[PDB]
Write a protein that binds this ligand. Structure first.
Ligand SMILES: *[C@@H]1O[C@H](CO)[C@@H](O[C@@H]2O[C@H](CO)[C@@H](O[C@@H]3O[C@H](CO[C@H]4O[C@H](CO[C@H]5O[C@H](CO)[C@@H](O)[C@H](O)[C@@H]5O[C@H]5O[C@H](CO)[C@@H](O)[C@H](O)[C@@H]5O)[C@@H](O)[C@H](O[C@H]5O[C@H](CO)[C@@H](O)[C@H](O)[C@@H]5O[C@H]5O[C@H](CO)[C@@H](O)[C@H](O)[C@@H]5O)[C@@H]4O)[C@@H](O)[C@H](O[C@H]4O[C@H](CO)[C@@H](O)[C@H](O)[C@@H]4O[C@H]4O[C@H](CO)[C@@H](O)[C@H](O)[C@@H]4O[C@H]4O[C@H](CO)[C@@H](O)[C@H](O)[C@@H]4O)[C@@H]3O)[C@H](O)[C@H]2NC(C)=O)[C@H](O)[C@H]1NC(C)=O
Ligand SMILES: *[C@@H]1O[C@H](CO)[C@@H](O[C@@H]2O[C@H](CO)[C@@H](O[C@@H]3O[C@H](CO[C@H]4O[C@H](CO[C@H]5O[C@H](CO)[C@@H](O)[C@H](O)[C@@H]5O[C@H]5O[C@H](CO)[C@@H](O)[C@H](O)[C@@H]5O)[C@@H](O)[C@H](O)[C@@H]4O)[C@@H](O)[C@H](O[C@H]4O[C@H](CO)[C@@H](O)[C@H](O)[C@@H]4O[C@H]4O[C@H](CO)[C@@H](O)[C@H](O)[C@@H]4O)[C@@H]3O)[C@H](O)[C@H]2NC(C)=O)[C@H](O)[C@H]1NC(C)=O
Ligand code: NA
Lengths: 913, 913
């Protein structure tokens, strides 16, 4: 009596529009833009001005229709279900011409009993799914005077208005780094399940919660306590009374084989738990903190009398604790010298760590075409930059299991969020009920992933949208604050706590922490909000100061506990532009390039050249103020070269912020995180990304890689006081010692006399997760530099130590390269360094040599036909010094000839015709 | 009392669509596609699948509206005219809200008296021109059962149907090498003319006819007779009775200053003539036949009593006779050994010459954007290929004066045609009246150009469309034949003869000649048609055999008097593709590349993949049968390389035809012309062009240049009999002597023993415009080639002689390079020739060297940022031999760095991964 399953992917689909005049072959899973492009009705959606030209698609219905489905049993002993892991979004499902369901949530698994439709069916049943125009439906919802309305500043759009009314990925209606395609379709897998009486059940969803005994959300657990493994299984259809549960936990070697205890059951769910000795399971750690130990847990449900299980579920899991700590700074912390206020940090298995990484946005406007290969390449680039965390930004979406799997096994912590973002939302009973379906399904679905690090209720509420709402409508503000608490704390925190003991919570991405957490309270998390004291420090920080005159001025950076967002936009490579835009449109300010800059966004549906131009201007001023301004005679080389200068400014600014945040680990703030805005791009356009749509590295990720190294030497320049400081900062969990060499040369590479009055070398000791000051110098009073525009300081650090939980006693050697230029890059008197470049096919290394003088911001550019990244880039090179640079080849289309097309350049080349 | 003129270009224009929802800035002259693209409403019309996607434009009206026009006098002593040199096509002209005209001919100058509209105007007048949707209007015309209809095979479309009903450039509705944009707008210049009573007149158009006294159309004039200069001037408005005319003719040094005699006048025209001694004017000749002597003739019209002229007109003219000879082969010609029948050749100033060139199609789908620079570059490429003639193909259009000017001064003969093409046409009274406006205006306008070489009534009537009509509807055929004669002979020949004594005529582009020409006959040209005799030869030839198994088989080529059309399609360069199509679409058979191949055309409005694919297949089979078939690992290099093989096949086939046509000059046919199909491209697509849209040379023009040299040595291979013949052919007007070296080597460059049994060198004598056989050899019986797949024969000719009408006694040296391969290129055992390439900035030469062996089809490719052509390309190179190759730089965008981006390759490179 096994469950009979027809995968909807193997069925045959046709897609039709609303007006009866467009019919093309369909795919499942897909969305209509993708099936239209596949048939040649449209060009690649990311191209040209398609954000405008393709709006006829979002404005109408699309229907996915199967051919008659064969092979279903028509015996009435049998229950026939439709199971949909994702439908995007408002849809009308029909089976043999009967409306069987009307789904309205992208983020929910839907299931419908079609037994009776099948029975009435005079031939093989056709399944059809009629997907609405989302703008039209949300416009119709909003137009009613019977629903909630908010001030214009609170619901101000990017492109389409009214997004707060639909449980759909919010960026689908446009964002300040992406287009507004509002795609629809069967966006995740789906199938038909036929279940026979007294037979096998079907598994819908499985919540595995591995926690320390006594553990609660948001509180540090007892690391000496036994593990509790709790398993709760959702299913279709009939589980008999007095059901029993057993589990086998094996190395992903049996850890445990046993029965579960305290079994409970209801109509569609069965739950049990088991306790395991603290000494048995090996711990999961993030990358560079130990092993990524995982286990397979298979859970079987049997029924009194039955020889064999009728429900079996398997997940891959880890044994670890991950705490997000946002409560008060303790007396103990205060006496240690930490500024009072509220924490904002993470702990893994009881250990504090410095978080290093970025914000992950959706890699594509069409989730169905996002591949395993594409996401594996992206994770390679994340590891290589020395990340241990991504913030999975809201709102794109809840990531599919397969993406958390990648994180799990590589050791990247995923700070996760519910899909609510940069606006205020409804809190009627029906909207909430829909949200609760969503929060309950996804919290349960995702809970077993070792990479999952926290849940936050949504993006930018207490730090941005709530105070906008207070300002915009003071009289109604306490009402909208109550809805916030009611939805994001009372409903949502209770839902998470009901389904997880292991994952901590915050009602939004940035806030001043909590005063109390207690489920006995009507609002179980009592937020601090603005109940603050002068001198105290709370919360994580943002930094988006676009005034280019203070960009490198550390007195303008925020003093906080964790930096979860910060950035400036930059152009992508010309090779990236070349993917999406016409050759004649390749200039800094062409109409198409400007219209693709959504910084700043249109605020609606117009072609807003003015707002886009504001971003164009920010980049232009940044370059003009700090970097040589290209003036290349070939207009193509001029565009390419201007694109690269914008990237240099972004890299250097992020470096400047990251080293300041990291040093803060050892100052009274005790800063413990850096997540730059933003890791990646959704299309080809000027943004905050470090990784372009296809994966190509900007200058940023090469610089952040170095600046995210375990042990770094960092140069801090107070340019008003003309004072230089060099600090050494380490994220290791034990003290380390080492040395930094400090070599002053002119831009031809000749040493400056007496090393400009500075020591050639100095030793250091630095505490665990801490910093130490090793040099201070007034450039005019204490150093003797004959010409500051003909000077560079080359900094090399070496240190010895162990990574956390290292097995081997053999100590690792840590090295960091850096430089300090006592003027702005545009003031440096660089000359042609006469770079030589060659490739060695045996060693697979490029050799780069400066022959005539010092090269600044040396830069290798791989060609179009290849994907990957170099082991270093944007570096200082002195003549005679030979540098070897390898490349991680992820994909090659050039049959190996790409090595001959690689080029090298430096700052000098920005200045030539 | 001077004429007051407002140029409509300096007025301010707005363009609006039919439905009130599109408004953009306008230009005059322009067309709506161009003004829409300029405003960013659409992308470049030539891009992607815009032939489909842009059809919403042709389907509706576009209105060009001025701002209120200032500065017109409102005195009723004054006549105010609108003068339009071209409006495309059906339009409604309004002036101060009054319909003043409804033009319906692209090819006519329209003028309208708006004096009364101006007088009623309560403020400054607005001029508006509402342009129709042409498809809609011709569909409406055709739908009426009151108009003529033809069999489907006769009016079979390319894309839009019904084109026979509109006097508009026929290719605007699509052709088998171009798109169907059906553009509309003020496509040529226009202005407002205010004329005061008793003042200056305004010149509309001026017919200058310089002929030999007694000369008539189509008959060889007397070269010893005096020149008659006839000047007929069209004007607005009032010329008083008893007007007089004088002329000054000056070097373009007075040739003549005098009065005109036999003056006649009517309402809008004044005419007079003057006779000049045969000894006074220096003659105009085509390029490489003498000087391009031109003169300025200024004609003034004065009135009894008036001190100064009231009408002045200036044209640039030449003194020469050009005969198109299509009458019977004379007894004299027969006794000389020429096959009987009818001639088809040209004579310049009484001398026969061999015509060499190609068919010129419109360079752009939008005539307004065609520039002087663009057409100058095209004429450079024409001269460089050794052309002396272009056939200005119908139907595109009647060329503007400025293009004939370029031809005039460079010496390129322009065989010109009336705009009727590849279908049969109406012959109602209104249609004819419209045509007569057209033929009369353009014949008069163009007559003074020395480059003008003939008028033919239209393309493909008697050789194609008439026999299709006889086959398709035998009963109605005599009726449609009568309309043909009535329109294209009775009406049109009379109209030309009324306005020109100097320019010969043919009722269509290809026919068997005439039996009689006599204006006393009801049909003044009595066509031979099919009144033929076995063994006799008539007419010019076409050749479009697409069966690749006979392409190089000279027994399949047509034996005629002149070859006016012949070809095979080939892909353009990848750099050309890259202009118009997405990167992902760059493969031989992508959907976009296939859809842009209009060989074969859709036959209507569908996306006809099947018909397009037939052309794709022709090119594929051609390559597979004869040339190495690329299999490059990089898909981009694979596409590029497949594009180049198609070009090699086209070049070699044209060479094979041209040398066969030219040799025919000395055989009983006495062949006297080669015009290959086609010179140039209207957009980026696989076609018969030798010059791609932007001007880039295919392989074809490099090969035809050599094959159009004055003196050539040509290899004829009968591959069934395995016989080689080498002939020397000369187009000079006097005998020449010289020598040809014949060097047999293997593909490493080592001589074959005893030169394979062939003489190393041989002398020749060749008659004026004639040929001589210098070698015959059976490859197996008479030669000793150890391995025919490891053999090449390198042929170099040198000769001494004079070009026609050369002043200097110093004789010119003529050299021609060629080769013979005794197997097909795909059978040749080529090895890596190890080519070296360098550039010398002082000499501006590239040096090309084969280091390791013989290189076949050596090929330099200039990069994207530069326009021009090399002085040689696609050549055989033997090792040690150094070849220098210069480049005519027409435009550079790369600031001189393009020389470093030039690459070289050979046949060998098609075969590598
Ligand atoms: C392992 O794990 C698990 C998980 O997995 C766990 O379990 C858990 O637990 C928790 C705790 O307790 C809980 O929670 C809770 O909940 C509730 C509700 O409930 C309900 O619902 C639910 C849900 O459902 C859903 O889902 C599911 C799953 O999947 C399924 O099954 C179903 O079907 C459904 O589904 C649906 O829906 C959804 C949405 O929702 C969607 O998604 C889907 O699709 C569909 O549609 C459930 O679950 C439940 O259940 C249960 O119950 C029943 C009876 O009733 C049974 O039958 C069953 O079997 C079960 O049982 C279990 O549980 C229970 C409890 O509940 C117990 O008793 C038993 O024993 C067993 O175990 C139902 O149906 C809610 O309501 C709650 O809340 C409350 O509480 C809290 C604490 O806890 C607090 O805080 C809050 O606030 C509240 O309270 C309040 O109210 C109340 C009344 O209502 C009262 O009493 C109190 O007092 C209070 O009040 C107060 O205060 C206020 C203010 O503050 C004032 O005003 C007033 O006046 C006063 O004063 C909670 O949350 C859950 O539920 C569970 N789950 C399960 C599955 O089971 C376990 O535990 C673990 N283990 C270890 C060892 O650890
Ligand atoms: C384009 O796509 C869209 C989306 O797919 C299509 O719109 C959808 O059309 C279907 C079929 O008509 C509807 O389902 C049927 O609903 C009726 C009830 O009708 C009322 O309810 C609707 C309310 O819609 C909501 O959205 C509106 C905006 O459009 C908004 O203004 C309104 O306030 C509602 O919004 C609230 O609720 C939303 C959740 O629904 C929520 O997200 C919002 O936030 C908000 O809170 C109105 O459109 C309509 O005018 C009426 O007011 C119902 O009677 C039908 O019931 C049948 O099916 C169910 C199972 O689903 C079954 O239990 C019943 O017994 C019954 O079955 C029997 O009848 C069938 C035939 O009717 C028969 O086939 C069957 O065999 C049985 O015999 C059904 O549920 C969707 O509600 C609607 N969705 C929308 C609007 O979002 C649209 O038609 C497409 N257009 C084209 C041209 O193709
Ligand atoms: Na209010």
């Amino acid at each position: 009596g096994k469950a009979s399953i027809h995968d909807l992917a193997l069925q045959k689909w046709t897609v039709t529009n609303e007006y009866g005049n467009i019919t093309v072959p369909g795919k499942f899973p897909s969305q209509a833009h993708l099936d239209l492009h596949a048939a040649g009705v449209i060009g690649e959606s990311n191209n040209g001005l398609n954000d405008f030209d393709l709006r006829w698609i979002a404005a109408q219905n699309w229907t996915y229709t199967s051919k008659p489905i064969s092979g279903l049993s028509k015996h009435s002993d049998i229950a026939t279900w439709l199971v949909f892991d994702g439908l995007d979004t408002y849809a009308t499902v029909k089976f043999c011409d009967h409306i069987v369901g009307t789904p309205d949530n992208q983020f929910r698994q839907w299931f419908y009993d079609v037994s009776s439709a099948l029975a009435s069916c005079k031939s093989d049943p056709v399944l059809s799914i009629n997907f609405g125009s989302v703008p039209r439906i949300i416009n119709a919802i909003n137009a009613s005077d019977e629903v909630q309305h908010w001030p214009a500043s609170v619901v101000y759009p990017f492109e389409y208005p009214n997004r707060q009314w639909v449980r759909k990925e919010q960026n689908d209606f446009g964002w300040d780094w992406g287009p507004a395609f509002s795609p629809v379709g069967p966006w995740q897998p789906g199938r038909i399940v036929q279940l026979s009486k007294g037979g096998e059940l079907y598994s819908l969803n499985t919540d595995i919660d591995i926690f320390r005994k006594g553990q609660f959300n948001n509180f540090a657990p007892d690391q000496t306590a036994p593990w509790v493994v709790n398993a709760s299984l959702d299913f279709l259809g009939t589980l008999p009374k007095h059901a029993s549960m057993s589990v086998i936990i094996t190395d992903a070697s049996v850890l445990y084989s046993g029965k579960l205890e305290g079994v409970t059951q209801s109509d569609m769910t069965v739950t049990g738990s088991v306790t395991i000795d603290a000494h048995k399971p090996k711990l999961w750690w993030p990358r560079d903190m130990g092993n990524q130990q995982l286990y397979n847990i298979t859970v079987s449900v049997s029924s009194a009398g039955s020889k064999t299980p009728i429900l079996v579920s398997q997940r891959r899991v880890g044994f670890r604790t991950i705490l997000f700590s946002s409560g008060n700074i303790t007396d103990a912390q205060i006496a240690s010298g930490i500024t009072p206020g509220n924490n904002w940090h993470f702990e893994i298995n009881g250990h504090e760590f410095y978080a290093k990484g970025a914000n992950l946005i959706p890699p594509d406007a069409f989730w169905p075409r996002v591949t395993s290969d594409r996401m594996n390449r992206l994770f390679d680039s994340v590891e290589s930059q020395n990340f241990n965390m991504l913030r999975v930004w809201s709102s794109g979406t809840y990531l599919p299991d397969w993406i958390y799997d990648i994180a799990d096994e590589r050791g990247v912590l995923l700070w996760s969020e519910f899909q609510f973002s940069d606006t205020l939302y409804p809190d009627s009973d029906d909207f909430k009920a829909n949200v609760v379906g969503e929060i309950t399904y996804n919290v349960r679905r995702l809970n077993h992933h070792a990479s999952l690090a926290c849940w936050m209720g949504g993006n930018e509420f207490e730090n941005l949208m709530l105070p906008i709402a207070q300002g915009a409508d003071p009289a109604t503000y306490p009402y909208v604050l109550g809805q916030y608490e009611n939805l994001f704390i009372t409903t949502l925190f209770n839902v998470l706590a009901a389904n997880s003991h292991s994952i901590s919570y915050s009602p939004c991405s940035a806030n001043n922490g909590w005063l109390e957490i207690d489920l006995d309270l009507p609002v179980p998390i009592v937020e601090r909000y603005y109940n603050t004291t002068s001198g105290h420090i709370y919360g994580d920080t943002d930094f988006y100061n676009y005034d280019t005159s203070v960009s490198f001025d550390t007195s303008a950076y925020p003093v906080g506990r964790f930096a979860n967002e910060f950035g400036f936009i930059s152009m992508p490579s010309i090779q990236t532009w070349q993917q999406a835009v016409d050759p004649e449109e390749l200039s800094f300010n062409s109409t198409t390039v400007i219209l693709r800059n959504h910084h700043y966004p249109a605020g609606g549906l117009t072609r807003n050249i003015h707002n886009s131009t504001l971003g164009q201007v920010e980049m232009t001023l940044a370059v003009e103020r700090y970097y040589p301004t290209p003036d290349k005679t070939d207009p193509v080389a001029n565009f390419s070269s201007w694109c690269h200068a914008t990237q240099l400014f972004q890299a250097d600014m992020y470096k400047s912020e990251i080293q300041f945040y990291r040093r803060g680990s050892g100052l009274p703030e005790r800063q413990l995180g850096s997540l730059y805005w933003q890791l990646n791009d959704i299309w080809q356009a000027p943004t905050w990304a470090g990784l372009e749509y296809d994966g190509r590295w900007k200058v940023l990720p090469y610089v952040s890689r170095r600046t995210y190294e375990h042990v770094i030497a960092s140069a801090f320049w107070n340019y008003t006081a003309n004072e230089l400081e060099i600090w050494v900062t380490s994220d290791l969990w034990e003290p380390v010692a080492g040395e930094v060499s400090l070599t002053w040369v002119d831009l031809k590479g000749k040493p400056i006399a007496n090393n400009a009055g500075m020591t050639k070398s100095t030793k250091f000791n630095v505490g665990a997760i801490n910093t130490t000051q090793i040099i201070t110098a007034n450039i005019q009073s204490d150093l003797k530099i004959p010409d500051t525009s003909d000077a560079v300081l080359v900094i090399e650090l070496t240190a010895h130590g162990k990574l956390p939980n290292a097995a081997s006693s053999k100590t690792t050697t840590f090295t960091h390269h850096n430089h300090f230029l006592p003027v702005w890059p545009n003031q440096a008197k660089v000359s042609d360094p006469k770079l030589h470049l060659s490739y060695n096919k045996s060693t697979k290394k490029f050799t780069v040599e400066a022959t005539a003088g010092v090269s600044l911001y040396t830069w290798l550019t791989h060609p179009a036909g290849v994907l990957g990244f170099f082991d270093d880039n944007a570096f200082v090179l002195r003549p005679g010094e030979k540098k070897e640079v390898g490349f991680t080849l992820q994909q090659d289309t050039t049959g190996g000839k790409w090595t001959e097309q690689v080029t090298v350049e430096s700052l000098w080349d920005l200045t030539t015709p």
